From a paper:
Rhizobium etli, a nitrogen-fixing bacterial symbiont of legume plants, encodes an essential l-asparaginase (ReAV) with no sequence homology to known enzymes with this activity. High-resolution crystal structures of ReAV show indeed a structurally distinct, dimeric enzyme, with some resemblance to glutaminases and β-lactamases. The active site of ReAV, deduced from structural comparisons and confirmed by mutagenesis experiments, contains a highly specific Zn2+ binding site without a catalytic role. There are two Ser-Lys tandems, all connected through a network of H-bonds to the Zn center, and three tightly bound water molecules near Ser48, which clearly indicate the catalytic nucleophile.
The orthorhombic (OP) and monoclinic MP1/MP2 forms show similar packing pattern with solvent content of 49.4–52.6%, whereas the monoclinic form MC, with a significantly different arrangement of the dimers in the unit cell, has 53.2% solvent content. In the close vicinity of the Ser48 hydroxyl, there is a characteristic, almost tetrahedral pattern of three closely-spaced water molecules w2, w3, w4, visible in all crystal structures, except MP2. These waters must have extremely strong H-bonds with the Oγ atom of Ser48, as indicated by the O···O distances, which in the highest-resolution structure OP refined to 2.2–2.5 Å. The water molecules are also tightly H-bonded to each other. Water w3 is also H-bonded to w1 coordinated by the Zn2+ cation. The attraction of the three water molecules w2-w3-w4 by the Ser48 side chain is a clear evidence of this polarization. In the absence of a substrate, the arrangement of w2-w3-w4 might mimic the tetrahedral transition state of the catalytic event.
Residue numbers in the entry:
A (entry chain AAA): -3 to 352, 358 to 367
B (entry chain BBB): 4 to 352
Amino acid sequence: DPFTMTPSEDFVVTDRGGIVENSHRVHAAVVDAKGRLLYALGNPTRMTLARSAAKPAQALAILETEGVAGYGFDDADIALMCASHSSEDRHIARTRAMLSKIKAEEADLRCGGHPSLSEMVNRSWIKQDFIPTAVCSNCSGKHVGMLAGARAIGAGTDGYHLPDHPMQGRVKRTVAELCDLDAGDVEWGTDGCNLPTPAFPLDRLGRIYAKLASAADGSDAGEGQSTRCAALAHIFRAMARHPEMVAGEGRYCTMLMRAFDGALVGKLGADASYAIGVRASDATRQLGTDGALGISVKIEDGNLEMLYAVVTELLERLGIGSPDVRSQLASFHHPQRVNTMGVTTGGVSFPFKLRGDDPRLAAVAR
Amino acid sequence: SEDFVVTDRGGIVENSHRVHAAVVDAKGRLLYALGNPTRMTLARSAAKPAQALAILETEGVAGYGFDDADIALMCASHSSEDRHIARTRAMLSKIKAEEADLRCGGHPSLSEMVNRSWIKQDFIPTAVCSNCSGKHVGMLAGARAIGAGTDGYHLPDHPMQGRVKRTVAELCDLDAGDVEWGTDGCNLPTPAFPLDRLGRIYAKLASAADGSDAGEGQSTRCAALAHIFRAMARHPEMVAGEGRYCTMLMRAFDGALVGKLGADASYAIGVRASDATRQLGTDGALGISVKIEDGNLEMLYAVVTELLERLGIGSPDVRSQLASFHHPQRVNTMGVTTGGVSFPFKLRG
Ligand SMILES: [Cl-]
Ligand SMILES: [Zn+2]
Ligand SMILES: [Zn+2]
């Protein structure tokens, strides 16, 4: 019944010959520069672990640490602070260059090695019997920034990663301030890289990225800015100018940001969260806002292939980009379902409905 | 019927996964359920014992001299270990066929450790490495046994596939129109039917094993089902491989049950009559089938283990062999425990 559809029915589905294989629940928020909710899928206020999609907020805490400007981090270094990188040789080399700028050593890092986020990098490592170390962490740039901040304020590099350290107090405050939340409305766990990681309502992740893009618009327009808005504009610019540092060759985030050529930034979180900050455009005005836009997505069950398909679908439904810009992402939008003998066996479909119908149809967030 | 397995990071919900499960008696009557026990479901590799039955019921196949380990490989989603490829080649030699006759293709191994070994050695898998290679050699054997020709043995209009289609519907106790068909990753037809009927197939496998052990008069079909059960339970390493759930589950239970994975996170178990089954309120064998709605395999194995604990199947000591699958490791890159898995579902009876 098309006239009784509900947020509880917002799915992405895979089929085999038209027979349902898997279904995945989708949650999404689309917000304006003040965080007002414009569009939604599923539960746009779902309490959600932002994971690596929080990294621009952690980069802001680093860049707002007094004395950090003195180390001479450049835009590619800031983009690495914002990264879940593929551990390509260029990412490891930049991590070592950043450690040299702060006179620190790989032994000061409190992140650990893991298999690469890139299948091709991981194949190179397997071929050479290479065991990844701390410097190879997808979060290595964030950790070097946290060490830089610790040294800058004279707090000591020992325990920079623990909640009692002032660098983590700064991160905690900065995340809550960008979300416009009380500290008690942000929950904290521990991440794969061994830092504190926040959880907050999904719409507030959209709000962070709307603030990033709004700051970029203010900077480009030559508006007078707070130190905080200038730092946010710098983070947006660094991610957009160096998208290969944010992820790497063949990665969604890098391909998305190269396709859009400065119009937006986007970032993956582990367990299938995504956030995008969109600069004011004809598309944002058509959506009914006079400023920048933020988008956040979660796939309930954590599937990354589905996340990238949904994010690309939602950009198409919001009219963000042109068909020609979005076509660079076609392999992610409609993932290949081809068997071991080259036969197409199925596909992906998007039985979800954006909401902004009878007044009597309740839209219960689910 | 809103039944989930949930993962957390420091008590904060990370992912949640919808669970469907059916527990059935030997006639397919529903005893217990999670979610929607009649969900239309692609059985994928969990249909393999029904396809093995079609092969074993083909006139002339007994002549090739397949042994129990060969039948276990017909029932397998194997890890493509060197021992699986060697048994595939031995089975091809028993039917005087060659790897070129197979119409399945190579894929990355279902074992990360095997796959890493292949990457290290620049090895490109071929048809003989397919997880389905044993099923394909059996389908070639059945085609050659009835003189149907090996060309197109995998196509729906080949008599081997008409035999498979009918045999699946018969074991489900469904009309042909109630079973849907797609194409699998190995390029064979693959069925979909209500989840409880996957449990019914496995209840029939275990019931057949009980009837055989008891010296009951059996149809050729019940004798063949008993043989398939015995082959899987005797050679569980052929069904999957080192470290795989299916192999560890069947070794732990030492003949008391068989279990099999389907791709995209289905699972089926056939349980021989026991003190546990009698306590659950049935006088015969039982079948269990599970689907994780979103396809997550780590969650499937956690749920299946949890369900065996809820049903009292095995002893605590037997089920402790599966502890790493029951409560999967949530340890970060620096050895710190960050989270875990919870089962906020309730079996309904
Ligand atoms: Cl590149
Ligand atoms: Zn991290
Ligand atoms: Zn197969």
